[PDB]
Amino acid sequence: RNLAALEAKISEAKTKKNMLQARAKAAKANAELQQTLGGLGTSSATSA
Amino acid sequence: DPEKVLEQAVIDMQEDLVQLRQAVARTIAEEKRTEQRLNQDTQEAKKW
Lengths: 48, 48
Fold this sequence. Notes:
This is part of a larger assembly, with 2 copies of chain A. By secondary structure, the first copy, chain A, is an all-alpha fold. Chain A is 77% helix and 0% strand. Chain A has one helix spanning 2-38. The longest helix of chain A is centred in the middle third of the chain and has 37 residues, at 2-38. The first copy, chain A, is rod-shaped and about 75 Å long. Chain A binds chain B through residues 26, 29-30, 32-33, 36-37, 39, 41, 43-45, 47-48, and chain B through 2, 4-6, 8-9, 12-13, 16, 19-20, 23, 26-27, 30. Chain B: Required for thylakoid formation. Chain B: This is Membrane-associated protein Vipp1. Chain B: It is found in: Cell inner membrane. Chain B: Belongs to the PspA/Vipp/IM30 family.
């Protein structure tokens, strides 16, 4: 019983952390789009 | 000096469009990856 439970616990702990990591990484990637767009061309090129 | 700056600003823009193309392609991977999962996953429910 301890093992069968522990195996399920391990299995989901790993899987949840992985898919969380994946969605966290994807989320910051989407945020990095907004940041790089916030890296607007409305810049010192005008000053040149 | 003008020509240096005006061309440089344009040069920067050529990088930027490639960076956002990467992010698009990355997003295409996210959709592909989730499709791959969800499609199989829904069958796994049936299997059990």
